Amino acid sequence: SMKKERVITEFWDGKIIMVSPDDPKYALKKAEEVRELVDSELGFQQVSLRCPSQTRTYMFVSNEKKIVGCLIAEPIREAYRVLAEPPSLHSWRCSTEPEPAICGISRIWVFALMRRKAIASRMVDAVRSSFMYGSVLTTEEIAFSDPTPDGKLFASTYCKVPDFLVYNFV
Numbered sequence: 228s229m230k231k232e233r234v235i236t237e238f239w240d241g242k243i244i245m246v247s248p249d250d251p252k253y254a255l256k257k258a259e260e261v262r263e264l265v266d267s268e269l270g271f272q273q274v275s276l277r278c279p280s281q282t283r284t285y286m287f288v289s290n291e292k293k294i295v296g297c298l299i300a301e302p303i304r305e306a307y308r309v310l311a312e313p314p315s316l317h318s319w320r321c322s323t324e325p326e327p328a329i330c331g332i333s334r335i336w337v338f339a340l341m342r343r344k345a346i347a348s349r350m351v352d353a354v355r356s357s358f359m360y361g362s363v364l365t366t367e368e369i370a371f372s373d374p375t376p377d378g379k380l381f382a383s384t385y386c387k388v389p390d391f392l393v394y395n396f397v
C-alpha cells in the first residue's frame with residue numbers, strides 16, 4: 228500500500244509533512260493518534276478547537292519513519308505580546324492591546340530525546356512557508372497558544388525577541 232503524503236521540506240535527518248482536514252482517512256487516522264500522543268504529554272483532555280476545517284497539523288518524521296515532532300497550526304486573526312509576570316513579594320502576564328496575527332501555534336512538541344536539534348524550529352519554518360499558499364509568514368505574524376516555560380524559552384529565541392505574540396490566555 229504505497230500512498231502519497233504531503234512533504235513540505237526534506238532534511239538530512241527527516242522530513243516535515245502536513246495533514247490538512249480534507250485529506251485521505253489514512254492520513255487523518257495517523258494525524259489523530261499523534262495528536263492524542265501530544266495532548267496527553269502536554270496534559271490536555273478532549274480539546275475540541277474552533278474552525279476545525281482550517282486546522283493543519285505538521286509532523287517531523289525521522290529517517291527511521293518515526294513521528295518525533297508534531298505541531299498543530301490553526302487560523303487566528305489577532306494576538307498579544309507576552310509580558311514577564313511581576314514577582315510576588317510574599318511567596319505569566321500578557322499585553323491588553325492586540326496586534327494582527329495570521330497563524331496560531333496551538334500545540335508544539337518534540338520527542339524528548341530529540342530536542343535541541345532544531346526540529347521545533349524547522350516545523351515552525353514549515354508553517355511559515357506552507358500555512359498560506361504563496362506567502363511566507365514572519366516571526367511576528369505567528370502566535371503561540373498558552374506557551375509552557377519550555378515553549379517560552381523556544382519562542383523567545385525563534386522569534387528573536389522576548390515579547391513574542393501569544394493567544395488563548397486566562
Ligand SMILES: CC(C)(COP(=O)(O)OP(=O)(O)OC[C@H]1O[C@@H](n2cnc3c(N)ncnc32)[C@H](O)[C@@H]1OP(=O)(O)O)[C@@H](O)C(=O)NCCC(=O)NCCS
Nearest residue numbers: 335336337342343344345346347348374375377378381384
Ligand atoms: C523542549 C523543546 C525546546 C523541544 O523542541 P526543540 O526541538 O528543542 O526546539 P529548538 O531546538 O528548535 O530550539 C530553538 C532554540 O530556542 C532555545 N531553546 C529551545 N528550547 C530550549 C530549552 N528547553 N531550554 C533553553 N533554551 C531552549 C535554544 O536557543 C534553541 O536553540 P539552541 O539549542 O541552538 O540554543 C520544546 O519545543 C518542546 O517540544 N517541549 C515539550 C512540551 C512543550 O512543547 N511545551 C511548550 C509548548 S509551547
